[PDB]
Amino acid sequence: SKPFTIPILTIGEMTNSRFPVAIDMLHTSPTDNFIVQPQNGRCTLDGELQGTTQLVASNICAFRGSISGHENNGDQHQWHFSITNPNGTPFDPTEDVPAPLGTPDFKGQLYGVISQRNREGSSNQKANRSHEGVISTVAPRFTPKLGSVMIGTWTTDDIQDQPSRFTPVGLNDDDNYKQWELPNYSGALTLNMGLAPSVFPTYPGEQLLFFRSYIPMKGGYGSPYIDCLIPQEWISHFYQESAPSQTDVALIRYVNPDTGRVLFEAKLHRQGYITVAKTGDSPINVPANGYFRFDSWVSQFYSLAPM
Amino acid sequence: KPFTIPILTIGEMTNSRFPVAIDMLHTSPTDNFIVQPQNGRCTLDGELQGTTQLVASNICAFRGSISGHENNGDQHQWHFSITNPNGTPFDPTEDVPAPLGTPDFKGQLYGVISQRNREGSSGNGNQKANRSHEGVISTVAPRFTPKLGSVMIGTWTTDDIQDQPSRFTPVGLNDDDNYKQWELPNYSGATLNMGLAPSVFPTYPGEQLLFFRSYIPMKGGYGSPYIDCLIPQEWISHFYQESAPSQTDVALIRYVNPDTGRVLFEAKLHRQGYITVAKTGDSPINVPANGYFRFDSWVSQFYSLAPM
Ligand SMILES: [Cl-]
Numbered sequence A: 001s002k003p004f005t006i007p008i009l010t011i012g013e014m015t016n017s018r019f020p021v022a023i024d025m026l027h028t029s030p031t032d033n034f035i036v037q038p039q040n041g042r043c044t045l046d047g048e049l050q051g052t053t054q055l056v057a058s059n060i061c062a063f064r065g066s067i068s069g070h071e072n073n074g075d076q077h078q079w080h081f082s083i084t085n086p087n088g089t090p091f092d093p094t095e096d097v098p099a100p101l102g103t104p105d106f107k108g109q110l111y112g113v114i115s116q117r118n119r120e121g122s123s124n125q126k127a128n129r130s131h132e133g134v135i136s137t138v139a140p141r142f143t144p145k146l147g148s149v150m151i152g153t154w155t156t157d158d159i160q161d162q163p164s165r166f167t168p169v170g171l172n173d174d175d176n177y178k179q180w181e182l183p184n185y186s187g188a189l190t191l192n193m194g195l196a197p198s199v200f201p202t203y204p205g206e207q208l209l210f211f212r213s214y215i216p217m218k219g220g221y222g223s224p225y226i227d228c229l230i231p232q233e234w235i236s237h238f239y240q241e242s243a244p245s246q247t248d249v250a251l252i253r254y255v256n257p258d259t260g261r262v263l264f265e266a267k268l269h270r271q272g273y274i275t276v277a278k279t280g281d282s283p284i285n286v287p288a289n290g291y292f293r294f295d296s297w298v299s300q301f302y303s304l305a306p307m
Numbered sequence B: 001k002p003f004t005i006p007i008l009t010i011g012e013m014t015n016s017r018f019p020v021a022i023d024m025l026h027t028s029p030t031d032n033f034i035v036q037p038q039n040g041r042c043t044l045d046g047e048l049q050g051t052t053q054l055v056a057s058n059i060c061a062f063r064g065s066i067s068g069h070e071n072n073g074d075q076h077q078w079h080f081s082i083t084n085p086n087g088t089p090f091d092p093t094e095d096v097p098a099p100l101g102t103p104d105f106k107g108q109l110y111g112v113i114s115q116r117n118r119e120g121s122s123g124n125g126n127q128k129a130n131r132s133h134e135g136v137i138s139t140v141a142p143r144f145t146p147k148l149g150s151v152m153i154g155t156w157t158t159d160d161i162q163d164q165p166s167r168f169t170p171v172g173l174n175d176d177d178n179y180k181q182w183e184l185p186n187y188s189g190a191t192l193n194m195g196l197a198p199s200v201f202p203t204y205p206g207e208q209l210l211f212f213r214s215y216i217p218m219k220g221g222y223g224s225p226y227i228d229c230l231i232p233q234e235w236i237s238h239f240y241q242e243s244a245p246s247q248t249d250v251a252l253i254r255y256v257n258p259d260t261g262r263v264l265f266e267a268k269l270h271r272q273g274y275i276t277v278a279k280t281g282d283s284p285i286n287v288p289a290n291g292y293f294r295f296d297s298w299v300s301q302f303y304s305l306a307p308m
Helices: A232-241 B233-242
Strands: A025-028 A063-067 A078-083 A109-117 A128-136 A148-153 A163-171 A207-214 A225-228 A249-255 A262-269 A273-276 A282-284 A291-298 B024-027 B062-069 B077-082 B108-116 B130-138 B150-155 B165-173 B207-215 B226-229 B250-256 B263-270 B274-278 B292-299
Touching (some): A063 A148, A109 B108, A109 B165, A163 B108, A163 B165, A232 B233, A262 A291, B263 B292
Antiparallel strands (some): A025 A207, A063 A163, A078 A148, A109 A163, A128 A148, A207 A225, A207 A273, A249 A262, A249 A291, A262 A273, B024 B207, B062 B077, B062 B165, B077 B150, B108 B130, B207 B226, B207 B274, B250 B263, B250 B292, B263 B274
């Protein structure tokens, strides 16, 4: 009975739900040779968060917890980062969640800053230190589901056994950055549980539509990007509204609000992703003022106008 | 038409003056401050003000390019030409204080400058070179002139910053020795600020402003700096989208524990986009983590709040 609605925000007014940066563009590409199963940015149209998805954009790809010395290999540039829930409460692995909320959902070298503030003041006047660090999501000691990750720094000294928070910035490099490959949240001992399901276009001629952002790198060559299924602000909206999905597919039109011109139409699936009738890898050129409007509920077999 | 506040706990919301989750509610007298923040400003009917924009991750961020060192300007300082957050050129002639998201406090803003070169490398598959480094943007430096289209950034490196497209991701403060959250920088340098959102203060007897407070990381030094915002970023996004007409100048809001239905306290949400409570003194506000504000009715500035 509660009507379903979509926010009126433009592309530049929204945030990528897989990395804490503004959305740069809409983009579509063939993905049938990938397993498209992101864990951040997952919410059904009726407001059910899935995977590792939480509500605060600034906590996406962030970690909070404390450092407890080095790992077992004795590498003086690597540190054991014990992690909690984003709220500071202890993470409970017995819940069927893949990892603490906001944990990165891709294989790669997550680059950012680790900041510390000591538990006890020097007088208050607590000591602080921050340094650049890299959290490899493919390292054997990347075990967020078990409560810890390994962080590498360029300094082998100035990291203490103190409360710590990691603010993400981008990637260290993109040599092996695989946005559609999930990390092993429990290490080589990984049986990932509680995952949001993979998504895929079933109707002929359709591809997934993504909200794409290009992300910074510490060094190296490349223009890495990350594609989310729906913006963080849509997740916030669906979570609040909890409007029942009347069918499996909401028909949405991307409209120029000045002219009423429809740039294209798309299928917004109840699972929280979009498909369009387009073939090939290309950005979607739209006016900066445009946004999606909900039109009606249709079936999985509705034939969209080609883009 | 009907007015609503999002059902979000404070740990589910973002400070509108720095991109971090809200840690606590706090109230204190402000008679010794001019409370005129420029980020986190939105009226209840959805008018953004000051330097306020909608993307939390763009608060205290800059986008643009590096154009060499500053005049002088040592080898650790660089001229950061800034654009609008969406990449379009910033127009200084608008009655706006500075590019959207510019910091609204005196301090040493610490974070990372990232660069991706304009042209690819023929030897690397026509791919663009990248580099990132820690940097500090002092909002009191003579060359902090964002309204004029540029700020100065200081780095520990002297040799690995190019004249290339650049973005600044904020992390915290370098130190807090001269951090003054209620003192605006000179957006045009040593020239009055323009386009400002109005300053706010309590007026009804026994009332104080209520703040949403977050602690901020530091690069080094001693301290636990915090920043206070008037309303959360998620409330701003909500009011902006709804554009619901404010029926009076004050919405009466109650902070409720949803488990018990108990009202912990009540507050006045003013049309301008800020909250007052009937409390005297610099005090924390002890409330359950699951609590949130609920809109109850439209009242006036004469409404007498129950004390807390
Ligand atoms: Cl200067």
